[PDB]
Amino acid sequence: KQPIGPEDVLGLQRITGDYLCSPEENIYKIDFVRFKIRDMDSGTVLFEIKKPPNAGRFVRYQFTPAFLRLRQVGATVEFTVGDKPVNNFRMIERHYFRNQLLKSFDFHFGFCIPSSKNTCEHIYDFPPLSEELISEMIRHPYETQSDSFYFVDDRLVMHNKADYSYS
Numbered sequence: 425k426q427p428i429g430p431e432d433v434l435g436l437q438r439i440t441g442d443y444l445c446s447p448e449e450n451i452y453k454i455d456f457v458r459f460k461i462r463d464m465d466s467g468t469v470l471f472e473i474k475k476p477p478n479a480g481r482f483v484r485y486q487f488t489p490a491f492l493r494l495r496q497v498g499a500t501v502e503f504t505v506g507d508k509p510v511n512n513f514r515m516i517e518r519h520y521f522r523n524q525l526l527k528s529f530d531f532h533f534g535f536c537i538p539s540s541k542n543t544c545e546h547i548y549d550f551p552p553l554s555e556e557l558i559s560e561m562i563r564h565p566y567e568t569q570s571d572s573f574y575f576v577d578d579r580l581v582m583h584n585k586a587d588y589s590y591s
Contacts, residue, residue, distance in 0.1 A: 425449075428573075428580035433516055434530075438523045439569045444583045447479055452576055453506030454513075457541070464496040464547070478585070484566070485588045492558045492590055499546045510536040510576050515546075517572045521561055526568070527551040565589035 428444050460472040470491065513533040519526040531546045553561075561568050566587040574582035 429578050430514065430516060430573075430575055432580075433518070433571070433573045434528070436518060436571070437525055439518075439520050439585070440571055440583075443481065443585070444573070445580045447481075449580070450582050451506075452508050452510050452581060454503055454510070454574070454576075454582060456501060456503045458500070458502035460500045461548075462498045462500070463494055464498055465494070470497065481584045483584070483586045485586060487588060487590050489558075489562050489590055492553055492561060494550050496550065497548045499548060500543065501546065502541055502543050504541050505536050505538055507539050509538050512575070512577050514575045515572060516575070517570055519568065519570045521557065521568045522564070526553070526557075562590050565591045 425445060433444075455475075457475040458473070461470045462468065463470055470487070471485070513536050515531045515533070516528060517531075518528040527550070529546070529548055531544075533542075533544050536542050566589055568588040568590070570586045570588070572582075572584040572586070573580060574584075
């Protein structure tokens with residue numbers, strides 16, 4: 425599998441047909457152990473989970489119709505890192521509905537402490553979706569999908585996938 429940089433995903437217009445890297449390429453031993461999202465306009469915790477072939481790289485989310493009308497959500501993530509220093513840790517997450525790009529989020533993690541648990545907060549500013557897109561997304565669960573690409577020093581080290589229901 426050929427090497428991937430940010431420029432190779434920042435212009436994608438469809439969900440990838442397969443994972444762009446193998447689990448072994450995560451040489452920094454980055455392991456996400458907690459994920460929580462809060463609606464910034466209500467303080468409501470929309471979702472939270474703590475860690476217990478896709479090898480845990482695919483996740484299915486069950487959200488509500490109201491999620492599609494949110495303005496901003498804050499995601500709190502906790503992850504451990506191995507002994508190798510991690511510099512320029514970045515995540516590019518792209519969402520699509522039936523192969524139509526909805527929004528791409530580009531986040532740079534703060535300084536990552538080696539050999540320990542780290543915490544980061546990402547602010548997601550949601551795109552204002554058209555009424556027809558919202559109706560269709562509610563009507564067709566799991567046809568909304570995302571690719572989350574993780575890079576360390578401009579090299580792809582992790583690739584996760586997900587699909588969503590707003591029913």
